[PDB]
Amino acid sequence: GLQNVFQSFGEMLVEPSWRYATVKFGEVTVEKPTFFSDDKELEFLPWHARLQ
C-alpha cells in the first residue's frame, strides 16, 4: 500500500523564480514499534501503550 502511494506522487523541479533542486523517494521501509527510553531501547507492547 505505502509503496504505491509514494510511487504515485511525483515531485517536480523546485525553482524560486542556473541552480535547481529536485527530490526523489526510494524504497519505503517500516520498522517495528520500539519504545525510546532514556536508558536503552525496550520492547513495545499494546498494553504498555495503553497504560502509558
Partner 1 sequence: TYVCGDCGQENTLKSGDVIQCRECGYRILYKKRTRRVVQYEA
Piece of the chain touching partner 1 by CB under 8 A; list 1-9, 17-25, 34-42: 34-42
Contact status, residue 44 vs residue 51, Cβ threshold 8 Å: no
- Which triple of cell numbers denotes residue 52? 502509558
CB of 50 to partner 1, least distance (A): 10
- 39 is a site residue for partner 1 (CB under 8 A): yes
Please tell me the distance from the alpha carbon of residue 52 to that of residue 49, in angstroms, as a whole number.
5
- 48 is a site residue for partner 1 (CB under 8 A): yes
Please tell me the distance from the alpha carbon of residue 33 to that of residue 16, in angstroms, as a whole number.
39
The residue ranges that bind partner 1 (CB under 8 A) are 37-40, 42, 48, 51-52
